[PDB]
Amino acid sequence: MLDAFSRVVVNSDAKAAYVGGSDLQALKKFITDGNKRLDSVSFVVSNASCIVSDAVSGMICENPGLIAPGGNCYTNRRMAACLRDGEIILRYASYALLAGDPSVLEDRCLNGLKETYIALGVPTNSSVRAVSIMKASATAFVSGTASDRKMACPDGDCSALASELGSYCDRVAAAIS
Amino acid sequence: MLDAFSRVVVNSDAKAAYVGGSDLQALKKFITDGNKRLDSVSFVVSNASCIVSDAVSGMICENPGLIAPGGNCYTNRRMAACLRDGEIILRYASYALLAGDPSVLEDRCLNGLKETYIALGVPTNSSVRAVSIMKASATAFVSGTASDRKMACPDGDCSALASELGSYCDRVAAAIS
Amino acid sequence: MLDAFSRVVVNSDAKAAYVGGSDLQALKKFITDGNKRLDSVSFVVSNASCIVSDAVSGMICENPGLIAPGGNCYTNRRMAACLRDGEIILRYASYALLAGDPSVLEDRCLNGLKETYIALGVPTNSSVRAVSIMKASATAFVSGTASDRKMACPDGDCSALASELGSYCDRVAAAIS
Amino acid sequence: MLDAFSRVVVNSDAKAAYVGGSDLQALKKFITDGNKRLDSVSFVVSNASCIVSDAVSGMICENPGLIAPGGNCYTNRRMAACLRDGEIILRYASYALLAGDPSVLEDRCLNGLKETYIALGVPTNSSVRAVSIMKASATAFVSGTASDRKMACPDGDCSALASELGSYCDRVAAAIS
Amino acid sequence: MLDAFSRVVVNSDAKAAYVGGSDLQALKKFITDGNKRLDSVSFVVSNASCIVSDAVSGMICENPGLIAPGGNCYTNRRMAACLRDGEIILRYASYALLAGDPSVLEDRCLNGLKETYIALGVPTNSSVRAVSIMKASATAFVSGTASDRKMACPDGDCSALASELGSYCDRVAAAIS
Amino acid sequence: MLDAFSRVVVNSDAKAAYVGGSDLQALKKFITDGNKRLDSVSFVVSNASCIVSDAVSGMICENPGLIAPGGNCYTNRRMAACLRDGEIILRYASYALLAGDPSVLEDRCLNGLKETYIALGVPTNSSVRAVSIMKASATAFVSGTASDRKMACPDGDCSALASELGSYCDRVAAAIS
Amino acid sequence: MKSVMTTTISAADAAGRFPSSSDLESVQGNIQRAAARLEAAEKLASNHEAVVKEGGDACFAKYSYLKNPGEAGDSQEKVNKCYRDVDHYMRLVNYSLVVGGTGPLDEWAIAGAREVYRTLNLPSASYVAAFAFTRDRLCVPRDMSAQAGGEYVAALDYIVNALT
Amino acid sequence: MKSVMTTTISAADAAGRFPSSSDLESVQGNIQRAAARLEAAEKLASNHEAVVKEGGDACFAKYSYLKNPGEAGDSQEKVNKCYRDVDHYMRLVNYSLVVGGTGPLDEWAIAGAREVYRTLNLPSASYVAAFAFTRDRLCVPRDMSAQAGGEYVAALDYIVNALT
Amino acid sequence: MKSVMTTTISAADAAGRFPSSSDLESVQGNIQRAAARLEAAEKLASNHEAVVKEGGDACFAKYSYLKNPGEAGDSQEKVNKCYRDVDHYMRLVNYSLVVGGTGPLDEWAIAGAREVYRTLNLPSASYVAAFAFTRDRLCVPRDMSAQAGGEYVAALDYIVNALT
Amino acid sequence: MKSVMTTTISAADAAGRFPSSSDLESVQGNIQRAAARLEAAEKLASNHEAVVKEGGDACFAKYSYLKNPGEAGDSQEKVNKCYRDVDHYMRLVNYSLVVGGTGPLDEWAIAGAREVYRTLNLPSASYVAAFAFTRDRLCVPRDMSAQAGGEYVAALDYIVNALT
Amino acid sequence: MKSVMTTTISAADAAGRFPSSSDLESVQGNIQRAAARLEAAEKLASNHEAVVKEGGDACFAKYSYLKNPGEAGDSQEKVNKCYRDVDHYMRLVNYSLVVGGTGPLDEWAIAGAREVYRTLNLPSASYVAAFAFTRDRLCVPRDMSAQAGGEYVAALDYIVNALT
Amino acid sequence: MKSVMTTTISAADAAGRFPSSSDLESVQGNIQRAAARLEAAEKLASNHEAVVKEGGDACFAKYSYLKNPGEAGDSQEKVNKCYRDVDHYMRLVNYSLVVGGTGPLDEWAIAGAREVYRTLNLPSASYVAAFAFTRDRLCVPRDMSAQAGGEYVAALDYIVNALT
């Protein structure tokens, strides 16, 4: 896997170029915004259970067919597997936010996931919906706009972090289905 | 795997329905004729070696090319593997007869079988012949019409059992055809 | 794997024929020329490190793009794996020369190699070149025509063994092309 | 493992003797009281959670040192392992009751248990106490004298079954003391 | 493992000395009598089934308690395992004869053999007798003195080879004694 | 494994006590002196190859019997394995210095080490001397007193750090003697 | 699907054996016991709505806190899902009685239940309350024969144990 | 020792399960069928000397070549071992009948039999001849009841299939 | 014991590496965050009895049903064990703050908790109620500094997530 | 196909080695012994019909029971297959003598033979009788040179040992 | 690519954990230490051509024998590849300083280097000479700050130790 | 110890086989090639000090830089250890010629060599120089027979390839 820094050196390595001061503006910005990024990860992780449970429930309460006979969330074994998947996806998304790079999400989670869901018969439009609600809640906790909980912190702008976390969720939604 | 009883509840579960009195006529009949079914399994199992040997020998005497160079029963290693396959198929056929359901035959024996036989170059028509002869002998032992042995039992009609066993052999032929 | 003797046996077995005097003159010649064959293998193995390094270096110095960024010999890791492959190919070629049959080369080296090369992205044209240079040098040591080193041996003709080795190298080229 | 029947067989085989009429008086009685034995097993199993939890709690409420620092049930990890051990012991005890022979208990559970407990530092006195309480509760469910639950069954005498279960529990205590 | 040649090398290496003309006369003779050694191995191997079966049967017919209830050769399973051990022992003895060194016998057969025999409770005296009878027959085939079969060969003196093989059997006896 | 902070916790947990301000004096000191500790680890690691090679060579130059026939560093294989052990011991010593606790050294390196050395026959007195020379060189690099290399750093007192490293090396020798 | 037949066949298949005497004898027991559990299954099938209602009622009666805001049954729809869940189990009880094995309950209700109920804040004791009542509600011979009652109670005891 | 009980218990043990409904049902089948196989076991134990003799006699009647030099029965002591072997099988048939499973025959007679008979020149067809005769010698209800006879025949068929 | 140092060292050990650049950098971060979490630990160690009491009170205030017969608080001794349990977690929170990792909570509280609490009828929501309150009761700078409060809340959220 | 060259190469390949001194030395042995085994192979190929006939005749001369009804030599076609089988082995003996290894016999005759002859009532002793006679029939130097005869006998002894 | 972030993430992923306190604390070390290592990376990037020249010069100055016929530097093209190789390493040093881990050096230079230099007659001591010089050439605070210099030297020491 | 005999026996042992035709043939090759390699071994043993002298001299003649301060031959003891090493290889060449396999070289010289020489700053090309000279120094038929000379060169080529 790569992080925000090794991604820069991978791009520079393709050009056989040194990473000089001209290439280090974003990485510098990364460092001074480091404490905000650590807060963002913490806020997502500290509410992981609520994020996953609320999203899978949201997916189901919008599509009653999933819990009908033949539905992919029918029986406790399938429902548990769905909840597990939601937790796994949120986990790798938090990894990507901590690293400031999507590589760990692509390599260790999204790789071969669509093929697996197709083989299993997991409804991919519903999977995307679960991810979408996770994106809504997780980015809200990062922005500090979660309706029933505000995380204590020095006030400031975390919109960039929230948008970045959302982009990782976008990658998941695009990779599946 | 499923048996005759779990097959009904699987069908009923698809409609989210309880298994009631109007659904149990066939299953009560299954229990009533239970002793005959156990006899049918015993009569096949007790003559397994003869059933397999005679059928494989029957397949070869019908197709001499099998034991010629390039034939799939050529050399002791191939002949042993063929005798092995005959015993295995009959074994799963007897499993299904005991359970009153072809699922164990489908899941653990027939699944993929056509593809491995094609990959190995195992002649499918000769395979069908061996299965067809096993059907003749096995159903004869069930029906009590075997030429050189009649198993002891109260006189009665086992034509349903023999027909059921025959259908299991037919599924084998259909799976590799 | 097969050798020169079991190859004849396999061919004779296809016709259910005994191996007799009329089929053994080529194999008697195989035995009477055995010492030259043992020399040919020894001469290749004794210069294995030179044959491999020189061919890989020749491959690179004829196409410097291989060691440019994005090139398949870029970084020490890829270069090491490339040298490894060259040694491996020569090793299985030496195996075939000792046995007097290409089966060990085809079965335990060439089988699936093109597919893995396509998957990994190993350029086929460069690979063919490395093989081609290895052929020149190896056949040279067998023919005793290598420019910088002649191996000690009684004077005689080994054009047949050189051609045989050359055909083994040609098999490698054909398989990956 | 052995059951009541194979045990007799094993004892007779040591004498190279057939199992005859004189030896079957105890086995015929095993068959006669078979329904009671099935009830005795069902009653223990149907209250398994209550039996184990109450016994481990009884062991602890009698020796609170177990759940203090330096106690062998301190932390949730150890408490869970102890509860697991209690369930396992009862499970193999129920196995012995169903088979009418302690071999499954001796071979698969008690074999090497004392050595293991010594290695880990599991207090034998408390271990015996948990088994002792499990004996009281399980045999009570067999006898139908459990204070807060009487299992429905035809009136009769199962004192022999309960005594047998108690002997299996005694074997556990003996093996680790 | 070591052979007759590498054994000399090991001894010479221990004193940091080259293997010279003085230390070579025994090895030179080893090569001269090489065809005799190959005959000795062939004569034993070609009669392996007779050697093993006769020796094991001899052990039993000299120790009737082995096939009584509780006897270590009681039941077909144990008898088969004893026959297996006999063949195994002879096989490693033939290895040692071929190599002209007992190391392969000591390293891969006798090593830890005594302690498993103790743990399993196979009788030492009966095991020794099996070996001693194998020694009698095997050395008889080497000496060309076997009563009911003489192996064709140029008539000569193989007493040293018979004594050598006999020493290997004695190593087996001493190890399990 | 444990570090300096977890060791305090484990000790406190044994007394069922919270870790308060009274208990945190040394741990606060651990933090204030944190940069020196990181330097000490870096100084050892940056000179790992010299430390190990010089120690093993020192052990040998003081006892040439190690590289004689029968010596335990005789042949390249044994010499490499000894150099391997020296590196490993230093590596685990560096681990302990980084964590501020000997647990990782004791649990993952020293536990069982004497027994394997006794079984292998590697001399303990020579092993001890190899460690002692490593202790001299490594602590010198920590004290900044190494004769041919002084690592760059602000001037200060690292005697406690060096003495701590010495204690870890002494634990290695003690567990071996 | 664990039953007498599938268990014996699985054991035979693992060893590559034809059905033998012990396999046949085991199935004979399935024949003998079938009448009792089919009677229990049929009674349940004919009156499950009333039984399910009683089970769910017993749950909320014992744990009225469930109706408090933020709790598992703070809405009519959530309460409805509770009765639906009870109906789910009882249908699987019916299935298990027909099959003669805990298969339907094992695969379709029990497996993964802990993860689901933990994540969705569904107290296991609430389910226990529904099925402990359902079990204790039975009496013989009013509701069914003795052996039928034994099967009914045993299946419910199996659920309670799985929850505890 | 494979039986109804040991099979269902080892199956439950492999999954770490308490005995459940299907386990209990299986054992009930052992109860229903016991009388039949115990009758066969008793009849065998009471008259095994006569059955064994006819078994061995049938062998040597079909294969008199065994008495030729170098063959399995070229001596009186060898012939005695042959009848001893038959007795050992039949005693294991008796055991199998008692257990209600092929356990005794599997572990004590069949396991390793191929290896033993191959290395000792004991033709399998000879053993088959003894048990095929022993099997077909049965007639109901003279020797035993119908169900007892079925158990008797099934055990011998199991041996024959194992030899062939 | 999961911490900054034990994680990086174990990672280095798995690859057979000496401590390198990234290993030393990780420990530097431990130095920087140490003051924040150690303050939280001290403040907890000096006033834990008041904290624990409020956590336990919050549990029974929310779930008064616990004091009903057969429930986890139907006796004073059981109620006392509940407050004892809260003290256990909070002491392990203190440990986790000192270590700078979740190690103490992972090994000594969370591992096996699911099994224990289900067997003993200890509803996880009751524990959640105790720590959700404990978490929300905190306000900075009254009780501690901002970054100290962040560590305090984070450790309690870790417990809450572990229970849900 | 096990031979000197294939065994040597497989050993080298397993260790990832180029052919070395011991490898080349082993092949030199294949050269030296080739003449002896090729002589035996040639003599067999020139007169195999006579050798096979004597082999088959020896089998039925020793075991005349084979032609009894129900036995392996029931009919002329079955007898013909027996002689055919003898020819199969002897052709594979010829192959093995050419290869210089037991490869052809191992892969094409021995592998699976136990299972085949067991299922089809083919007594192993009958095959033994044919090849033991064939082995003992050899007369040196009448039929071939002493070293060719040794190879001939060795290959047949290999078959007999595999049958016993 | 080994770094503080990738090491701590892979460790959590191996245990299926969300990032916890120790993971976050480790990344804080990346924040504090970045200034030093980014400085060193910038100085190198600005003047690598001069540093590389001095590196290659020191190699051939210490080992003039390399210029002899048959040796690694006996042609202008070969000599140019040597300085190129030094540039390769130093560029990877720049990368490793930016990443904050030995990742770039591990994957792109060190892995496979032994096999390559062995086959191509490239003495490792020659490389050592270049980077030992480069390391000792540093003058603080002339070239960079003390901590930046510590990073520069550490990376070069990592290369030297791997080369010996 | 790799040789003809140990390779064939290890191959047979891996398949649980008695020695057979191909094994015996392989050993016959050891008999035929023995005289040549023994001649080379004895010739080496009778004059190894002179051979070692020329080997070590050729090393320092080609690499005189080794005697410079800080290099592997910058002392009298170090130089003596160099000639000692050359002697150790040549003694193992003698062993390998006696064994008829590369065994002695593999186990005692080659295994772990690159690790030792890397650690001790022992340039592999220095060893190559000594053995390349030793190899090319051979004079046929001045020093030995042509076949003995072939064995001599092949062993030295094996060492050279193992160093490059």
DSSP chain E: ---HHHHHHHHHHHTT----GGGGHHHHHHHHTHHHHHHHHHHHHTTHHHHHHHHHHHHHHH-GGGGSTT-TT-HHHHHHHHHHHHHHHHHHHHHHHHHTSTHHHIIIIITTHHHHHHHHT--HHHHHHHHHHHHHHHHHHHHT--TT----------HHHHHHHHHHHHHHHHHH-
Instruction: With CA atoms as reference, report the closest residue to G155 among G90, G107, G108.
Output: G90
Identify whether the C-beta of residue G26 lies closer than 8 Å to the C-beta of residue G6.
no
Annotated binding site of D for phycourobilin: 54, 129, 147-148
CB-based touch D/H (3+ pairs, under 8 A):
yes
Identify whether the C-beta of residue L162 lies closer than 8 Å to the C-beta of residue L108.
no
| Closest residue in chain E to residue L88, using alpha carbons only | E16
Where would I find the H helices in chain J? 4-14, 21-46, 48-62, 76-99, 103-105, 113-119, 124-137, 146-163
D11: Cβ–Cβ under 8 A, 6 or more apart, which residues?
none
**Is H141 buried (19+), middle (13-18) or exposed (0-12) by CB count in 10 A?**
exposed
CB-based touch C/L (3+ pairs, under 8 A):
yes
- Cα F155 versus chain centre, distance: 23
Task: Tally C-beta pairs within 8 A across B and C.
Answer: 6
- Within an 8 Å CB–CB cutoff, is residue H19 touching chain G? no
Q: Is J139 annotated as a binding residue?
A: yes
Inter-residue long-range contacts of E105-111, CB under 8 Å, 24+ positions, other chains counted = E105/E168, E105/E171, E105/E172, E106/E171, E106/E175, E107/E1, E108/E1, E108/L13, E109/E172, E110/E171, E110/E172, E110/E175, E110/E176
Identify whether the C-beta of residue K136 lies closer than 8 Å to the C-beta of residue K58.
no
- The position carrying tokens 């007869």 is B97
Identify whether the C-beta of residue E95 lies closer than 8 Å to the C-beta of residue L9.
yes
Give the DSSP per-residue string, H34-46: HHHHHHHHHHHHH
Enter the DSSP assignment of J69: T
Report residue I98 as tokens.
């000192």
Q: What is the largest CA-CA distance in chain G?
A: 60
Query: What sign has the CA pseudo-torsion A117, A118, A123, A128?
Result: positive
Residues of B in contact with H142 (CB under 8 A): none
Instruction: With CA atoms as reference, report the closest residue to D122 among D91, D84, D168, D170.
Output: D84
Instruction: With CA atoms as reference, report the closest residue to A45 among A169, A155, A157, A151.
Output: A151
- Within an 8 Å CB–CB cutoff, is residue J144 touching chain C? no
| H44/H98 Cα distance (integer angstroms) | 11
Report residue J34 as tokens.
């080739």
Report residue K3 as tokens.
């770094």
Report residue H15 as tokens.
């999954």
**Is E102 buried (19+), middle (13-18) or exposed (0-12) by CB count in 10 A?**
buried
Report residue I141 as tokens.
């700078």
Interface touch G10/B20, C-beta < 8 Å: no
Distances (CA, A) of G159 to D46, E85, G111, L18: 10, 53, 12, 60
CB-based burial, K120-138: b 16+ in 10 Å, e otherwise: eebbbbbbbbbbbbbbeeb
Give the DSSP per-residue string, chain H: --SHHHHHHHHHHHTTPPP-HHHHHHHHHHHHHHHHHHHHHHHHHHSHHHHHHHHHHHHHHH-GGGGSTTSTTSSHHHHHHHHHHHHHHHHHHHHHHHHTSSHHHIIIIITTHHHHHHHTT--HHHHHHHHHHHHHT--TTTSS-HHHHHHHHHHHHHHHHHH-
Instruction: With CA atoms as reference, report the closest residue to L17 among J162, E102, H120.
Output: J162
Nearest by CB to L150, from C47, C48, C152: name it: C152
Distances (CA, A) of E93 to E134, F72, L19: 10, 32, 11
Query: What sign has the CA pseudo-torsion E113, E115, E121, E123?
Result: positive
Distances (CA, A) of J42 to C22, E172, J36, J143: 9, 43, 10, 11
Residue positions counted in chain H: 164
- Start-to-end Cα distance in chain J: 23
Report residue L99 as tokens.
């064994």
Residues of L in contact with C47 (CB under 8 A): 157
Residues of B in contact with G35 (CB under 8 A): 31
| F58/F73 Cα distance (integer angstroms) | 13
D120: Cβ–Cβ under 8 A, 6 or more apart, which residues?
none
| E58/L130 Cα distance (integer angstroms) | 63
Task: Tally C-beta pairs within 8 A across E and J.
Answer: 23
Distances (CA, A) of K44 to A17, I159, K110, K138: 12, 47, 20, 11
Instruction: With CA atoms as reference, report the closest residue to A86 among A112, A60, A121, A119.
Output: A60
| H134/H132 Cα distance (integer angstroms) | 6
Report residue A58 as tokens.
């949201």
Whole-number CA gyration radius for chain H: 18
> What experimental approach yielded this model?
X-ray
Bond from prior residue into C123 cis (ω within 30 degrees of 0) = no
3-state SS, one letter per residue, for D30-83: HHHCHHHHHHHHHHHHHCHHHHHHHHHHHHHHHCHHHHCCCCCCCHHHHHHHHH
Distance from CA of I25 to the nearest CA of D (A): 33
Q: Which of E47, E74, E77 has the highest number of chain H CBs within 10 A, making it the mutation to test binding with H?
A: E77
Give the DSSP per-residue string, C39-104: HHHHHHHTTHHHHHHHHHHHHHHH-GGGGSTTSTT-HHHHHHHHHHHHHHHHHHHHHHHHHTSTHH
Residue type, G92: L
| D79/D81 Cα distance (integer angstroms) | 5
- Within an 8 Å CB–CB cutoff, is residue D139 touching chain G? no
Report residue K92 as tokens.
């990877």
Identify whether the C-beta of residue J28 lies closer than 8 Å to the C-beta of residue J8.
no
- Start-to-end Cα distance in chain D: 24
B84: Cβ–Cβ under 8 A, 6 or more apart, which residues?
J115
Give the DSSP per-residue string, K28-79: HHHHHHHHHHHHHHHHHHHSHHHHHHHHHHHHHHH-GGGGSTTSTTSSHHHH
Task: Tally C-beta pairs within 8 A across A and G.
Answer: 35
| F112/F176 Cα distance (integer angstroms) | 9
Q: For H1-164, CATH number?
A: 1.10.490.20
| H131/L142 Cα distance (integer angstroms) | 81
> What resolution in Å is listed for this PDB structure?
2.1
Give the DSSP per-residue string, I85-153: HHHHHHHHHHHHHHHTSSHHHIIIIITTHHHHHHHTT--HHHHHHHHHHHHHH--TTTSS-HHHHHHHH
Neighbours of E68 (CB within 10 A): 12
Give the DSSP per-residue string, F94-136: HHHHHHTSSHHHIIIIITTHHHHHHHHT--HHHHHHHHHHHHH
Instruction: With CA atoms as reference, report the closest residue to D166 among D144, D139, D146, D141.
Output: D139
H141: Cβ–Cβ under 8 A, 6 or more apart, which residues?
none
Residue positions counted in chain B: 177
Q: For E1-177, CATH number?
A: 1.10.490.20
Identify whether the C-beta of residue D63 lies closer than 8 Å to the C-beta of residue I129.
no
The count of C-alpha atoms lying within 13 angstroms of the C-alpha of B89, restricted to the half-sphere facing its C-beta, is 32
| G109/G129 Cα distance (integer angstroms) | 17
Identify whether the C-beta of residue H123 lies closer than 8 Å to the C-beta of residue H84.
no
Identify whether the C-beta of residue E98 lies closer than 8 Å to the C-beta of residue E163.
no
Residue type, D158: C
Neighbours of A150 (CB within 10 A): 11
| K55/K132 Cα distance (integer angstroms) | 9
Neighbours of E19 (CB within 10 A): 25
| A177/B103 Cα distance (integer angstroms) | 32
Identify whether the C-beta of residue G132 lies closer than 8 Å to the C-beta of residue G54.
no
Neighbours of E89 (CB within 10 A): 24
CB-based burial, B8-17: b 16+ in 10 Å, e otherwise: bbbebbeeee
Q: Is F82 annotated as a binding residue?
A: yes
Distance from CA of K101 to the nearest CA of I (A): 5
3-state SS, one letter per residue, for D95-157: HHHHHCCCHHHHHHHHCCHHHHHHHHCCCHHHHHHHHHHHHHHHHHHHHCCCCCCCCCCCCCC
J32: Cβ–Cβ under 8 A, 6 or more apart, which residues?
L25, L28, L29, L32
Bond from prior residue into K141 cis (ω within 30 degrees of 0) = yes
Give the DSSP per-residue string, A4-68: HHHHHHHHHHHTT----GGG-HHHHHHHHTHHHHHHHHHHHHTTHHHHHHHHHHHHHHT-GGGGS
J6: Cβ–Cβ under 8 A, 6 or more apart, which residues?
C1, C2, C3, C6, C99, J101, J103
Q: What is the largest CA-CA distance in chain I?
A: 60
Neighbours of F169 (CB within 10 A): 23
K154: Cβ–Cβ under 8 A, 6 or more apart, which residues?
F42, F46, I21
C120: Cβ–Cβ under 8 A, 6 or more apart, which residues?
none
Interface of D with H in 87-106 (CB under 8 A): 88, 91-92, 94-95, 98-100, 104
Bond from prior residue into L141 cis (ω within 30 degrees of 0) = yes
Identify whether the C-beta of residue I55 lies closer than 8 Å to the C-beta of residue I90.
yes
Q: Which region, left, alpha or beta, applies to residue B100 given φ > 0 means left and ψ of -120 to 50 means alpha?
A: left
| F159/B163 Cα distance (integer angstroms) | 92
- The position carrying tokens 């536990």 is F111
Nearest by CB to F48, from K140, K153, K161: name it: K161
Instruction: With CA atoms as reference, report the closest residue to L157 among L126, L135, L139, L124.
Output: L135
Interface of F with D in 5-64 (CB under 8 A): 13-16
Residue type, F144: G
- The position carrying tokens 């096949």 is B44
Identify whether the C-beta of residue I121 lies closer than 8 Å to the C-beta of residue G164.
yes
Residue positions counted in chain G: 164
| K129/K89 Cα distance (integer angstroms) | 13
- Within an 8 Å CB–CB cutoff, is residue C69 touching chain A? yes
Residues of H in contact with G31 (CB under 8 A): 29
Domain ranges of chain I: 1-164
Instruction: With CA atoms as reference, report the closest residue to E69 among D1, H110, D12.
Output: D12
Identify whether the C-beta of residue C2 lies closer than 8 Å to the C-beta of residue J4.
no
Query: Measured at the alpha carbon of residue K20, what is the angle toward residues K16 and K25, in degrees to the nearest 5?
Result: 135
